[PDB]
Amino acid sequence: TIRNQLEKEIRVSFAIGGTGFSSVNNDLETVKMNPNSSYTRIIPVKAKFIGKHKMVVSAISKGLIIDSKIIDINVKPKLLPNPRL
Amino acid sequence: RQWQIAVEKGVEFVNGEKYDPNHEKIRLVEETLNNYREALFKGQIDVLTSIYAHTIGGFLTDVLGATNIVEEEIRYGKEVTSKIMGNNYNPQGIWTPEMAFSMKLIPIYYDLDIKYTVLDDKFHFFHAEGNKDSQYEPYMVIDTESKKYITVFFRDHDLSDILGFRNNFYSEPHAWRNAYEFALRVAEKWFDKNVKVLTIALDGENWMSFSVNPPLTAYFLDKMIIYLETLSDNKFIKLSTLREIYNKVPANRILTNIPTNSWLGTFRKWRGEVPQHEEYWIKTYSVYRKLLAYEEMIGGRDEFSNEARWALWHALDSDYWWAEFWLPKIIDTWLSVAENILNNRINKIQIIDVRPASEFYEDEKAGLVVTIRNQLEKEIRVSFAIGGTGFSSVNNDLETVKMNPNSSYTRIIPVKAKFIGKHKMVVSAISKGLIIDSKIIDINVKPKLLPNPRL
Amino acid sequence: EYWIKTYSVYRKLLAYEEMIGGRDEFSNEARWALWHALDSDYWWAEFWLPKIIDTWLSVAENILNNRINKIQIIDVRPASEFYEDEKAGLVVTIRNQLEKEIRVSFAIGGTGFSSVNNDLETVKMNPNSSYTRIIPVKAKFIGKHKMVVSAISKGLIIDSKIIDINVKPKLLPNPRL
């Protein structure tokens, strides 16, 4: 969720980060949010290790990092199903 | 072993009541074990080893893939049997818990000098591929990738289920009539000339204590035993033990594959028939995966890994996972014992320092130091991967180090930045795909400015 | 009509000799009876003598059919439950009542069934014993299927068996939360 507290419609992008997290296909996802409102979107990411993860999301415009946020995600091991009968 | 830990010191129950090794109830435990021991060394009976904590072996090797847990636990169960029986007994046969077989059990059994076993005919024979005549023969099931082999006896599912399940009697001579009927069914198998070895396998106590009137079930047992004696004095059958059959009847037919299965025809009784099975299976899998990571760090086993392995045996016991007797409280109690021994040994490895080994410029190669400290008393092998919103190292999936006890370890890693501004670097340590520790720092990347136009 | 007859009889002999991996007393002593049926003097159009060609083909057609009827298909069952468009298992047992070591092949058939990858699976079994093997198949439709398995040797179908499998739909799982 990106909040816009300005009085104009500003378009900004953000990049994700993390030790194992890898966005499936998005080099830079640009949003376009009108004045005095938020804007939410979902992004596909993929994890590599299991356990206590640190994930960084940073807003970027013209190669410049505006702001960054750190979130915590717990990744669980994928267990295989039963032998079929 | 529960019988043994009562003979030398009395047991105390969780409800409060307790006994002493001189209590007369304990004297009833000692002469039972003495009876079994005397009968075994008289040659009357045969004693099988098994997995110590009764667990579904084919499921663990297939679904979970925890091969190492099964082998050590089988050898522990075998040494317990060899010790409590006494006289340096060496059991050659094993009872596979719940007849949950997998072909990856063949190398485990071969390496432990396990010779024969018992499977099901309805669920393991009709689906087993290879040379077959009938289920009434010892078969030599052989692994193909290792050429290791065991001998297999297939029980008769129907004749076992008829005495195990159809045992609800209502009168004194009713049990006698049913015992005659059951012994009668055994003799009918003799007319068929293909029935060479007849095997019956079932639970020893549950058929007797879960009938509508358990007292008459013991009378049924006496009647059935005395009837089967009259089929051997007329020289119809040769009532013997499985060890004698193993030596007297060599296995000639060769099976090459028996699909994974139990006598229930499914594995859904311990995974699926209770809504909260997957929740606990993921939990026990994470606990075991942490154990593998820790045993990779120190490059083998020690006292703490072995004590976590001990506690992980009891959590995976299939008697608690049974859907009807679902007991999540005891599984949670044993997983916590194993997860605390492992958590107090992995928190000793920290990332104590990460800083730039230079000052950072946009899309210019710089260096970043990482300092790992090892507070264990052992030699550690860790690997760590970095993270960041725009950062990218040259080439490193996992950079592994090798650092000796009570010491630190610093190394410099090269990374590129892609943006300018206020970057956030995440550095995390990994062992066997498990993130051990992670530390976040803050790096300022400055724009790279071109040099003066050359003259 | 009689040329097709004698060609069928000879190609049955070839199939049987492929099964046992060579010649034996039965194959030789039916091959003997095949010589006298192909004699050009009984086929000569003026002295067309079908009642001696039949007499000699019948002798060889009975020596071969009493040695091929000893290879059956004793059971064919699914090793699991069948779902639409999902590789499943099928276990087939072949019995050998001869005193020799037989080599046969079999091909599967059905209205929607299709072997994953097996054009012809040749089993290889020792005397007076069965031999079973699981084969991968893939169902296409849902409902009450009829599936045929036929034993085949040198292009000649030995015996065929029909079974009844029920294929149920594959239903998609829940949205994750």
Q: How far is B127 from chain C (nearest CA, A)?
A: 6
| Token output for A32 | 């376009």
**How many angstroms separate the CA atoms of B229 and B239, rounded?**
8
Sequence-distant contacts of C38-41: CB under 8 A, at least 24 apart = C38/C6
CB contact under 8 A, B259 and A65: no
CB contact under 8 A, C128 and B133: yes
Cβ under 8 Å to A: B residues 387-416: 387-391
How far from C9 is each of B164, C44, C62, CA to CA, in Å? 56, 20, 10
Helix (H, G, I), strand (E, B) or coil at C149: strand
On the CB side of C171, CA atoms within 13 Å amount to 2
| Token output for B288 | 């075991």
- Which residue is closest to A85 within chain C, CA to CA? C80
Sequence-distant contacts of B279-287: CB under 8 A, at least 24 apart = B280/B328, B280/B331, B281/A79, B282/A76, B282/A77, B282/A79, B283/B335, B284/B312, B284/B315, B284/B316, B284/B331, B284/B335, B285/A77, B285/A79, B285/B64, B286/A50, B286/A76, B286/A77, B287/B312, B287/B315, B287/B335, B287/B338, B287/B339, B287/B342
Q: What is the 3-state secondary structure (H, E, C) of chain B?
A: CCCHHHHCCCCECCCCCECCCCCHHHHHHHHHHHHHHHHHHCCCCCCCEECCCCCCHHHHHHHHCCHHHHHHHHHHHHHHHHHHHCCCCCCCEEECHHHCECHHHHHHHHHCCCCEEEEEHHHHCCCCEEEECCCCCCEEEECCCCCCEEEEEEECHHHHHHHHHCCCCCCHHHHHHHHHHHHHHHHHHHHCCCCCCCCCCCCCCHHHHCCCCHHHHHHHHHHHHHHHHHHHHCCCCCCCCHHHHHHHCCCCCEEEECCCECCCCCCCCCCCCCHHHHHHHHHHHHHHHHHHHHHHHCCCCCHHHHHHHHHHHHHCCHHHHCCCCCCHHHHHHHHHHHHHHHHHHHCCEEEEEEEECCCEEECCCEEEEEEEEECCCCCECCEEEEEECCCEECCCCCEECCECCCEEEEEEEEEEECCEEEEEEEEEEEECCEEEEEEEEEEEEECCCCCCCCC
**How many angstroms separate the CA atoms of B100 and B118, rounded?**
11
B62 touches chain A (CB under 8 A): yes
Helix (H, G, I), strand (E, B) or coil at C48: coil
Resolution of the entry in angstroms:
2.9
Cβ under 8 Å to B: A residues 16-55: 16-21, 48-55
**How many angstroms separate the CA atoms of B181 and B89, rounded?**
38
Touching subunits of B (3+ CB pairs, under 8 Å) are A, C
| Token output for C125 | 């079994």
**Which residue among B286, B422, B438 sits closest to A77, beta carbon to beta carbon?**
B286
Residue the block writes with tokens 């009541």 = B17
**How many angstroms separate the CA atoms of B128 and A73, rounded?**
45
Nearest residue to C14 via CA among C159, C120, C160, C155: C155
Q: How far is A28 from chain C (nearest CA, A)?
A: 26
Experimental method: cryo-EM
- Which residue is closest to B253 within chain C, CA to CA? C129
Q: Which residues contact C165 (CB under 8 A, 6 or more apart)?
A: C78, C82, C113, C139, C145, C147
Nearest residue to B390 via CA among A28, A42, A1: A28
Cβ under 8 Å to A: B residues 413-452: 418-424, 426-428, 430, 433-436, 438, 440
C81 touches chain A (CB under 8 A): yes
B252 touches chain C (CB under 8 A): no
Nearest residue to B139 via CA among B251, B21, B57, B259: B251
CB contact under 8 A, A50 and B434: yes
Touching subunits of A (3+ CB pairs, under 8 Å) are B, C
